[PDB]
Design a protein around this ligand. Structure first.
Ligand SMILES: O=P(O)(O)O[C@H]1[C@H](O)[C@@H](OP(=O)(O)O)[C@H](OP(=O)(O)O)[C@@H](OP(=O)(O)O)[C@H]1O
Length: 343
């Protein structure tokens, strides 16, 4: 007696949906074009952003690849993508948890930078007055990511305390300090729960963001006067600093590593030696500054800096660290630059 509906066949539409997804996961530009041509997606940056944000059956690494691109359209998609995230009334860790669920960070430094700039800008708009600049937010985001790696990756031996995390971030708020309890809250959140990463392979940027800076006591040979001195070395931002005491703010000397190279060397008396030298200008004095006993700062007089380590293992470690510093890392450098514009 009762009438019944006419139900339409859904075979072809579901097939197109599935086809579009399959295509996207192999090539995001081509999948998006297929869906648009098949009237399953609208062509605006906002519409593409909603599609990626929902991400139904979409590979999150592929989403990140597409959003990071320099194309005018992709830049617009990215901004609309970040706008679909609500960061209001969330702290920076909580906002990062949310954002990092939606895609997987690409490998290329310029792509990461575009995405994290877009995130930081959005966070600051959602939470005005928390950070004095977008730069502050961006840098702290990477401090949080590095903390996640330090705490949760077993390859990092020395786990930072809350107090280390707080002091590491001194000056980040455009020259001033962020609230102690805010930094503590961020630290505690990460300590309690690592970033949960979708489709995690165990090699995500958030788990492998290591700190390459180093410190330690070594014995160094003098310039004009050939005496060996025990000095506290710090390697950071492609420069080798050395100090009389670990507690000094004023270094005994500063050796920019730009244009230098390092080689293992035999010494008649000291074991485990290496040398900094300028490979392009043989015999040339290395640009450096140091302090004299009278308190003057003067140019260094070294053609080479010969340095003795207490073990072959430590020599190897320092050489590796110094070589890595010289070859540089584009993203480390980009962070360095933002930190300089903060200060
Ligand atoms: O301490 P004495 O025996 O007087 O000898 C000093 C030290 O070796 C200095 O090392 P440090 O600065 O670590 O104390 C060195 O400066 P460098 O740091 O430039 O190697 C001086 O080189 P010259 O200034 O080039 O002579 C050298 O005269």
């Amino acid at each position: 007696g009762h009438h019944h509906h006419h139900h339409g066949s859904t075979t072809q539409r579901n097939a197109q949906i599935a086809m579009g997804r399959k295509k996207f996961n192999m090539d995001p530009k081509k999948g998006i074009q297929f869906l648009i041509e098949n009237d399953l997606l609208q062509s605006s940056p906002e519409d593409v952003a909603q599609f990626l944000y929902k991400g139904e059956g979409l590979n999150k690494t592929v989403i990140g690849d597409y959003l990071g691109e320099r194309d005018d359209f992709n830049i617009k998609v990215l901004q609309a993508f970040v706008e679909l995230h609500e960061f209001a009334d969330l702290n920076l860790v909580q906002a990062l948890r949310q954002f990092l669920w939606s895609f997987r960070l690409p490998g290329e430094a310029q792509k990461i930078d575009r995405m994290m700039e877009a995130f930081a800008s959005r966070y600051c708009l959602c939470n005005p007055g928390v950070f004095q600049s977008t730069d502050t937010c961006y840098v702290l985001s990477f401090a949080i990511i590095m903390l996640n790696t330090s705490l949760h990756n077993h390859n990092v031996r020395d786990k930072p305390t809350a107090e280390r995390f707080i002091t590491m971030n001194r000056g980040i708020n455009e020259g001033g300090d962020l609230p102690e309890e805010l930094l503590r809250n961020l630290y505690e959140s990460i300590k309690n729960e690592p970033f949960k990463i979708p489709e995690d392979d165990g090699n995500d940027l958030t788990y492998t963001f290591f700190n390459p800076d180093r410190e330690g006591w070594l014995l160094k040979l003098g310039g004009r006067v050939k005496t060996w001195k025990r000095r506290w070395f710090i390697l950071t931002d492609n420069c080798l600093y050395y100090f009389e005491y670990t507690t000094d703010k004023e270094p005994r000397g500063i050796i920019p590593l730009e244009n230098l190279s390092i080689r293992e060397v035999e010494d008649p008396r000291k074991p485990n030696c290496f040398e900094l030298y300028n490979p392009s200008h043989k015999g040339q004095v290395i640009k450096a500054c140091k302090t004299e006993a009278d308190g003057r700062v003067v140019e260094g007089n070294h053609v080479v800096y010969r340095i003795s380590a207490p073990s072959p293992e430590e020599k190897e470690e320092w050489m590796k660290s110094i070589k890595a510093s010289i070859s540089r890392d584009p993203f480390y450098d980009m962070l360095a630059t933002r930190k300089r514009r903060i200060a």
